[PDB]
Amino acid sequence: IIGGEFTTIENQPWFAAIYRRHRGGSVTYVCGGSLISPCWVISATHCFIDYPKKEDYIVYLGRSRLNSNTQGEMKFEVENLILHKDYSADTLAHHNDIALLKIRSKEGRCAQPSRTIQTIALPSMYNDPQFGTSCEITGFGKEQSTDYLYPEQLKMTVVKLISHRECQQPHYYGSEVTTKMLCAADPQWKTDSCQGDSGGPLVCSLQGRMTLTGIVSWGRGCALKDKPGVYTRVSHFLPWIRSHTKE
């Protein structure tokens, strides 16, 4: 997250931290995700496309810090890693950039709700807030495009939804953005999601309800003028989410 503020998990208690164990034992951070039901974390396919093997991954809920434990956290193996069949990531834009991870602890349990672990509501179909609405994004991603390190502490910021009309402009993204994607940015381009934030939540208040409106997907650089963050439009993937969460 470029700019914004530091936060803790009780301000995004659905946020999932996803790691991969390497052949050799070393664990590195992959992407964020969102707990949408006790056994299901939702994220982005591009986080996993090159390493689609479910055994490689570890998921944490209730974690506020990247490389140290948070009291009350829960660690999970990935029982099932479901990627979207129609994903495509030639061109800059990633299409159908959505993934599901069924979570299971060593003891065979899913998520137990607590002060630091709760679920997030999905939007009703094709129901998104109007452009210029302020939404929040969360993640352990870079604080600067040039950084080598990820922050140790979870971060959050606010960005505003951009119309498809505005985002399809040549001086923005042209034809790369589709109607199954949402653009969102800061008016001054001073704050944004960035590398490491992918898969994480774009959360909007939709009828006085917290809603998983988007999933951090792609962008050209971070917090660059005329280059918004691009997010998977969750309200356009509900049938896909419904069927696959029975797997």
């Binding site: 986080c47 090159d50 870079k142 490491g196 992918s198």
Partner: peptide, 15 residues
């Protein structure tokens, strides 16, 4: 910049 520093290219073989 360089695509391997962007959202979209996390956890990728060529990065």
């Amino acid at each position: 910049d360089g695509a391997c520093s962007w959202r979209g290219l996390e956890n990728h073989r060529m990065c």
